[PDB]
Amino acid sequence: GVVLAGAALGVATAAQITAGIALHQSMLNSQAIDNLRASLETTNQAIEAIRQAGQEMILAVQGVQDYINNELIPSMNQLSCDLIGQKLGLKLLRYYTEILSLFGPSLRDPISAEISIQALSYALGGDINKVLEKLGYSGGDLLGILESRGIKARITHVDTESYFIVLSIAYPTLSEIKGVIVHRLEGVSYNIGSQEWYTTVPKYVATQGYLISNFDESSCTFMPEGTVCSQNALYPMSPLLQECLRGSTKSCARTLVSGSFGNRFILSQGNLIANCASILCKCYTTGTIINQDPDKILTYIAADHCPVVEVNGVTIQVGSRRYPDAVYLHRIDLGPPISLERLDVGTNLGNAIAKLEDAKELLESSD
Amino acid sequence: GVVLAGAALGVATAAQITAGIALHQSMLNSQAIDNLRASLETTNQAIEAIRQAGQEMILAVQGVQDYINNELIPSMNQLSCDLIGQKLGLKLLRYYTEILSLFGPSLRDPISAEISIQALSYALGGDINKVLEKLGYSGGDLLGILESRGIKARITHVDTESYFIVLSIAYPTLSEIKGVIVHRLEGVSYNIGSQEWYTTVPKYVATQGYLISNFDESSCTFMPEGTVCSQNALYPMSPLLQECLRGSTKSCARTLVSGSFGNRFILSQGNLIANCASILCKCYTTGTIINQDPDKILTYIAADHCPVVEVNGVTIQVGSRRYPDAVYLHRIDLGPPISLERLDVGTNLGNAIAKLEDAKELLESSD
Amino acid sequence: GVVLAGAALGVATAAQITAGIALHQSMLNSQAIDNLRASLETTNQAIEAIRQAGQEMILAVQGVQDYINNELIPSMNQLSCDLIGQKLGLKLLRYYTEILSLFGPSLRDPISAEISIQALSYALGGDINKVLEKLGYSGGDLLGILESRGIKARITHVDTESYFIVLSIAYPTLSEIKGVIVHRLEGVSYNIGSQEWYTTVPKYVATQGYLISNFDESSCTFMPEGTVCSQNALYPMSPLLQECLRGSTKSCARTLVSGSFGNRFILSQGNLIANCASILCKCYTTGTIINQDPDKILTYIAADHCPVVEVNGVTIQVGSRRYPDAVYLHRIDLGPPISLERLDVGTNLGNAIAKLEDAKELLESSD
Amino acid sequence: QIHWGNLSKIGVVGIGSASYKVMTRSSHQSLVIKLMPNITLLNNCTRVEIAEYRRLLRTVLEPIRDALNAMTQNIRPVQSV
Amino acid sequence: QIHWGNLSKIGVVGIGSASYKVMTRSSHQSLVIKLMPNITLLNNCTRVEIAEYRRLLRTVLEPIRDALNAMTQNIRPVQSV
Amino acid sequence: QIHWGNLSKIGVVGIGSASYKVMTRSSHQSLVIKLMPNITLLNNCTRVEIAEYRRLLRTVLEPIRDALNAMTQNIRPVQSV
Ligand SMILES: *[C@@H]1O[C@H](CO)[C@@H](O[C@@H]2O[C@H](CO)[C@@H](O)[C@H](O)[C@H]2NC(C)=O)[C@H](O)[C@H]1NC(C)=O
Ligand SMILES: *[C@@H]1O[C@H](CO)[C@@H](O[C@@H]2O[C@H](CO)[C@@H](O)[C@H](O)[C@H]2NC(C)=O)[C@H](O)[C@H]1NC(C)=O
Ligand SMILES: *[C@@H]1O[C@H](CO)[C@@H](O[C@@H]2O[C@H](CO)[C@@H](O)[C@H](O)[C@H]2NC(C)=O)[C@H](O)[C@H]1NC(C)=O
Ligand SMILES: NC(=O)c1ccc([N+](=O)[O-])cc1NC(=O)Cc1ccccc1
Ligand SMILES: NC(=O)c1ccc([N+](=O)[O-])cc1NC(=O)Cc1ccccc1
Ligand SMILES: NC(=O)c1ccc([N+](=O)[O-])cc1NC(=O)Cc1ccccc1
Ligand SMILES: *[C@@H]1O[C@H](CO)[C@@H](O)[C@H](O)[C@H]1NC(C)=O
Ligand SMILES: *[C@@H]1O[C@H](CO)[C@@H](O)[C@H](O)[C@H]1NC(C)=O
Ligand SMILES: *[C@@H]1O[C@H](CO)[C@@H](O)[C@H](O)[C@H]1NC(C)=O
């Protein structure tokens, strides 16, 4: 059991406190350092598993050794001594540039920093596959590949006497959260007159019991059997946008299509949902065009009326009906038109606040 | 004519449907593959135009062949057999790392993905100039350079028996939309008291008949004879910001200058527009300082009053007047002050919603 | 003294005007070019200080010379003439690719562009340390390293006859603004029921006399004796968020924690501030758990009640009390709940504007 | 459309206009990434490394091949309807 | 939870759901970056370059070592209380 | 200025302050990118590659040279007024 001297240290985040305790538990013993220092001195490989019986294996990596061993040593009696030093000097400066970039002042908090194995690539000789193979990763299936690339390292010791950096890594494994479902959303444009609109919804959302949540897909991979994320992906969603996804069409915002056109049709549940005001829709089976009622905004095409439909020049056979026949626009409450560009958000917000400060003075005068 | 089996496939975006049909039209015939497989086996170049009379030319690229041919083969009888394999093994692992990064699980939808020629650079041997030259691009003018770098590839075949990837590219050419004008906007600060403000407008806007639109300059190059974009750049602009650009000064938002100072003067139409409260303005011709009326916010300097002006230490000769003499601030309706930082937007929006929910209960009580 | 012909040039930003004048003052004299052209022709080093007595030293860098001198020349009588040209041709194409990327059409305004020394790395041979060393930077302390990497270059001459580019650099030195204090803010979550919240504040803010400002930490390094920024970091903060930081708790917004949990404790002024509804808190000294009053939102742990506290499994000794005993939630005015995700901001703003346009028609009817 | 006069009163000017040209893609050309190099002039000195390379590639290539087959198997000639 | 019917009336559909798996880190393994290469088979031909490399590294390594010591010196065994 | 007491009641603390130093640029130094390497010890073995390199460079360099001349030709000595 150890205790943190909090009055002495005065201030620290939870991330720094927990990494500091972890630093005490995972750092090499003071004489394990002396053993490692002597083992490192006597090796000459680019990567080497240092086994001292009793203590755990330590993986040692030397970032320019492959170049020295493969390119410089075989030239030892064919190139001059000055040239050999000049050749190695270029490698050392480029390697120092990487050490500086990764471990230099751009590294804010060395105690709680977690460095991804891929960011260490140049420090480890320009490639990480042999490191991962020495740790047991075969490269035989994509999941093990994703896990191997999710490895993060913490710094546990910096030796200024012998110039080496000891890092501690941990192995990622998958933790399935069975109550969370990730959903990919996809929209098609619809027409009001000659204006082409679409509903603004997130590309990915998550359901979790009572909750609908936002989903950050940055750190995720959509494998065939599940979404694999190396970091937390869930984050809160405003009640209003949750209400939109729960069926309140008036809560969903909308905007006009960018450029010339939007996504104007989609295949879903074996049916074609299509903005047939914006593209030519045609029944291939009968040869007859499919007109969009001008007081409807979309067409829901299924095999009950057209087994094989042509849509913007592509011919698609469809299945039995899974979406009702389009309803009149007048039976659909559309939500507010918006822009997501940040200057538009700021300019319209400034206007709204001014209109509200005006409105806030009159209902005092009249009441 | 082909048809998509939509009931079998069930769900697909328009992008996937159209790429899938394109995949059927552009993929090599089943026996064209057997021809290609045999041609690839018997070549030894880094890049090679594979011509089989009748069928089209196929450009073959081998990502480590230059290294084998230029560095390894000339060493064959001077370095050991183990060393040769070790040297090539380092190249193969680095090359596999690039194949994994580009074609691995980070590639969401291989059917509709479009890979830029520059993203293929490492897969093609670390440089794309020789590929482009074999396709006919000379590098003789900048437009052909931009078009050549706008090439995108689609995957049409992956051979797991002989380990090769067939891609289909298309050639970009320029499509001028004569009714769209791109405009670069540039602001100067102005003073209210000792507060230094500027109007918040987009850096680029587009006019298109009745419309003013936003303009995403990311994929564009501002050539001397037109703006060349490799992607759609136009996207909607809110009515309020359009009204701002149409002359409603009260619709334009404003904010305080960052840091110490803003852009405090500008040359436009041969005149100098200057915040002379914020810098020293002086007529060089007469030697007399140019004071800014404290109930004016800017000074419009032209040769009718000063042929050669000094402004923050730079001496500029100006032309005849193209902007009226500054008007009093009291004859200008300024718009709302705003911040575009996202936490400020969110915090002020939360406040506005609360004030509106308060205001919404009182006008029910009083009415 | 020089004058800009503003009527002839017609339009220019202040940045372009000032760089253009600087271009006239810093460009080499017309015959200094002829001297430089002849000096460059007769050298063969990768980097070389060109000293012509009278005129200043000019640092010349040749981007493929180390490769020619170290790799190609020693092979001159062991490899064929075709192979030598092929080897160099690969380097030249890769080098041209870098020249094109940096000096090609992606460089919008060559007169006022400022290119960082690190962006020039490949143009200078793949590393900048030897360039910086020739300029006097030792690499002996981190501040000189940061300054050396803050060097920016301006283009002053492009020679199409002899193919060289003359750049002018300036040396960064530190300008302390003694009235500006940078503050790092850090939040812990708190509980209302089983809902876990936190206050939304910026990670860094700056105080400056009367002002609280936003702070962009992008270009900054937090050295032990001060924050060193290579660019202006200060930018305006909305009055409402300034009021939040000035003690108006109702002006501070709040949101729910992402993922499973937030930062649930922190060490500050030798005390532990902890959300003890969300983690196990326990006095190690007495062995007794520390319950959070359900009408309190946080616990302020100091040595007056517990000299050694255990918090989520970490044991921390704390100092004398620096934060009062927690107050009841009912004595704290909480601010609005918000989301910072941009679709949520846009969707809720659209709703707010609609509610305000409704509200704006009724108080005309009733008044 | 843009009101330059009123914008200039609040410090905003236009410093350039240009026509708008977008890139459209046409025609076609096949490009093949040959993943397996010709190593015969290395006389089996890279046999171990090549076999390992091939095995690493398979893990990446098989899912792409499968995704392409999943699509093209749902694309039939017109009269199958 | 999500109302697919009403969303489809404004053009929004779900095109896929999946379970959610996050990576958690466990166990431990030590990795050492050996900054000083073995140069003995180069017979002092790189002596100047190695000494300069070592000097450049020191500027970077000393602040990290100091930061780590600043933390671990405040971590004592339980009974020092 | 910042009210640490009230902020601590909603879980916000300051964990560090520092002075603010910004970089300002001064003096000058000329740097020349020599695009054409010295190839004489290669005895015309790179003649084709060098000529092609030079031709590729021209397309890039000429517009920059022209932009610089467009500016400096509008910068005259004081008495031309
Ligand atoms: C599906 O959408 C419609 C709106 O398009 C919803 O119907 C509205 O419901 C509210 C009250 O819940 C009524 O005040 C409106 O008059 C209704 N509008 C129309 C056009 O009928 C309907 O509630 C939504 N369904 C669900 C489950 O949310
Ligand atoms: C140019 O700007 C001024 C505002 O600075 C506009 O004048 C205002 O116009 C509205 C009605 O359109 C009046 O209610 C205001 O009283 C006017 N304000 C002032 C100070 O005169 C003017 O309309 C703008 N010009 C254009 C073409 O939009
Ligand atoms: C610290 O926070 C409390 C709110 O939590 C502030 O007290 C409020 O002050 C306003 C007027 O300034 C009163 O109308 C409210 O009734 C007060 N609320 C409560 C719960 O007391 C207090 O002012 C803040 N202190 C400072 C310096 O801003
Ligand atoms: N209103 C609530 O009850 C609410 C509850 C939880 C959260 N939450 O994210 O955890 C956010 C909420 N409210 C909003 O998101 C509206 C909003 C959106 C953007 C900017 C300002 C205000
Ligand atoms: N009001 C309209 O008629 C409107 C019409 C079209 C579009 N359009 O972008 O296509 C946007 C519109 N409205 C806004 O942009 C106001 C706004 C801006 C940011 C966040 C919320 C609301
Ligand atoms: N109200 C003011 O007096 C104010 C003064 C100066 C600045 N300034 O940044 O310099 C901003 C101000 N106002 C806001 O930031 C509110 C806001 C925030 C985001 C979007 C719209 C409106
Ligand atoms: C370097 O390598 C040699 C051969 O592997 C080894 O015997 C020796 O211990 C190392 N020498 C030094 C000085 O580290
Ligand atoms: C490799 O290259 C040689 C020489 O170019 C060529 O003859 C041969 O067909 C290729 N050999 C194999 C096994 O692919
Ligand atoms: C190239 O280098 C040689 C040796 O350094 C030098 O003498 C000569 O002036 C240069 N030659 C040419 C043609 O530039």
Which residue in A105, A241, A335 is closest to C343 by CB distance?
Answer: A241
Instruction: Please name which of D40, D38, D36, D39 lies closest in space to residue D58, comparing C-alpha atoms.
Output: D36
Do A83 and C74 make contact, defined as CB atoms within 8 angstroms?
yes
Instruction: Please name which of B209, B192, B213, B190 lies closest in space to residue B200, comparing C-alpha atoms.
Output: B190
Which residue in C223, C270, C353 is closest to A348 by CB distance?
Answer: C353
Residue of F34, F36, F39, F40 to mutate, ligand 9, most atoms within 8 A of C-beta: F40
Q: Where are the domains of chain F?
A: 37-76
Closest Cα in chain A to C365: A366
Method: X-ray
3 state SS of B77: coil
Query: How far is C49 from C284, CA to CA, in rounded Å?
Result: 67
Residue D27 is encoded by which pair of tokens?
A: 């025609």
Q: Which residues contact B241 (CB under 8 A, 6 or more apart)?
A: A343, A344, A347, A348, B201, B202, B212, B251, B252
Instruction: Please name which of A4, A49, A36 lies closest in space to residue A23, comparing C-alpha atoms.
Output: A4
Resolution in A: 2.3
Chains D and F touch (3+ CB pairs under 8 A): no
Please state whether beta strands E12-34 and A226-229 pair in parallel, antiparallel, or not at all (unpaired).
parallel
CA-to-CA dists, residue C313 to A321, B195, C261, E80, angstroms: 57, 52, 16, 18
Give the containing element (helix H, strand E) for F17. strand F12-34
Give D29 to chain A, closest Cα distance, Å. 22
Alpha carbon of A322 to ligand 1 centroid (Å): 21
Q: How many CB atoms lie within 10 A of CB D46?
A: 23
Alpha carbon of D57 to ligand 8 centroid (Å): 22
Ligand number with the minimum distance to the CA of C42: 9
Do E81 and C139 make contact, defined as CB atoms within 8 angstroms?
no
Which residue in E59, E78, E81 is closest to C141 by CB distance?
Answer: E59
Please check whether residue C220 is in contact with residue C150, taking contact to mean a CB–CB distance below 8 angstroms. Answer: no
Alpha carbon of A69 to ligand 7 centroid (Å): 12
Give E14 to chain B, closest Cα distance, Å. 9
Which residue in C3, C93, C297 is closest to F81 by CB distance?
Answer: C3
Ligand number with the minimum distance to the CA of B346: 4
Three-point CA angle A47, A52, A57, nearest 5°: 50
Residues of chain A neighbouring E52 (CB-CB closer than 8 A): 89, 92
3-state secondary structure chain A: CEEEEHHHHCCEEHHHHHHHHHHHHHCCCHHHHHHHHHHHHCCCCCEEEECCCCCCCEEEEECCHHHHHHHHHHHCCCCCHHHHHHHHHHHHHHHHHHHHHHHCCCCCCCCCCCEECCCCCCCCCCCCHHHHHHCCCCCCCHHHHHHHHCCEEEEEEEECCCCEEEEEEEEEEEEEEEEEEEEEEEECCEEECCEEEEEECCCEEEEECCEEEEECCCCEEEECCEEEECCCCEECCCHHHHHHHCCCHHHCEEEECCCCCCCCEEEECCEEEECCCCCCEEECCCCCECCCCCCCCCEEECCCCCCEEEECCEEEECCCCCCCCCCCHHHCCCCCECCCCHHHHHHHHHHHHHHHHHHHHHHHHHC
Residues of chain E neighbouring B11 (CB-CB closer than 8 A): 13, 15-16
Closest ligand 6 atom to Cα of A346? 20
Long-range contacts: C143-146, Cβ < 8 Å, 24+? C143/C174, C143/C223, C143/C228, C145/A100, C145/A104, C145/A105, C145/E59, C146/A105, C146/C221, C146/C223, C146/C228, C146/C230
Closest Cα in chain C to A367: C367
Is residue F38 in contact with ligand 9, taking CB distance under 6 Å?
yes
Do A317 and D81 make contact, defined as CB atoms within 8 angstroms?
yes
Please tell me the total number of residues recorded for chain C in this structure.
Answer: 367
Alpha carbon of C69 to ligand 9 centroid (Å): 12
Closest Cα in chain A to C78: A78
Residue of C36, C39, C40, C42 to mutate, ligand 9, most atoms within 8 A of C-beta: C42
Residues with CB under 6 A from ligand 1: A 247-249, 331-333; E 3, 6
For ligand 3, atom 26, the nearest C-alpha belongs to C247
Please check whether residue E29 is in contact with residue A136, taking contact to mean a CB–CB distance below 8 angstroms. Answer: no
- Residue listed under structure tokens 């460089």: C107
Residues of chain A neighbouring E44 (CB-CB closer than 8 A): 81
Residue C14 is encoded by which pair of tokens?
A: 């202040």
Alpha carbon of B245 to ligand 2 centroid (Å): 13
Q: Which amino acid is at B211?
A: L
Closest ligand 1 atom to Cα of E6? 1
Is residue B345 in contact with ligand 4, taking CB distance under 6 Å?
no
Q: Which residues contact D76 (CB under 8 A, 6 or more apart)?
A: B2, B3, B5
Residues of chain F neighbouring C156 (CB-CB closer than 8 A): 30, 68
Closest ligand 5 atom to Cα of B238? 15
Which residue in C6, C240, C335 is closest to B317 by CB distance?
Answer: C6
Chains D and B touch (3+ CB pairs under 8 A): yes
Q: Which residues contact A310 (CB under 8 A, 6 or more apart)?
A: A280, A281, A282, A283, A284, A316
Please tell me the total number of residues recorded for chain A in this structure.
Answer: 367
Domains of chain B, start order: 6-169 (no CATH), 176-260 (2.40.490.10)
Closest ligand 5 atom to Cα of A341? 19
Chains F and C touch (3+ CB pairs under 8 A): yes
Question: Does the beta carbon of F67 lie under 8 angstroms from any beta carbon of chain A?
Answer: no
Question: Choosing among C11, C17, C83, C108, which should be mutated to test the D contact, i.e. which has the most D CBs within 10 A?
Answer: C11
Residue C241 is encoded by which pair of tokens?
A: 């968020």
Three-point CA angle C322, C326, C328, nearest 5°: 155
Query: How far is C107 from C110, CA to CA, in rounded Å?
Result: 6
3-state secondary structure chain C: CEEEEHHHHCCEEHHHHHHHHHHHHHCCCHHHHHHHHHHHHCCCCCEEEECCCCCCCEEEEECCHHHHHHHHHHHCCCCCHHHHHHHHHHHHHHHHHHHHHHHCCCCCCCCCCCEECCCCCCCCCCCCHHHHHHCCCCCCCHHHHHHHHCCEEEEEEEECCCCEEEEEEEEEEEEEEEEEEEEEEEECCEEECCEEEEEECCCEEEEECCEEEEECCCCEEEECCEEEECCCCEECCCHHHHHHHCCCHHHCEEEECCCCCCCCEEEECCEEEECCCCCCEEECCCCCECCCCCCCCCEEECCCCCCEEEECCEEEECCCCCCCCCCCHHHCCCCCECCCCHHHHHHHHHHHHHHHHHHHHHHHHHC
Query: How far is B63 from D36, CA to CA, in rounded Å?
Result: 9
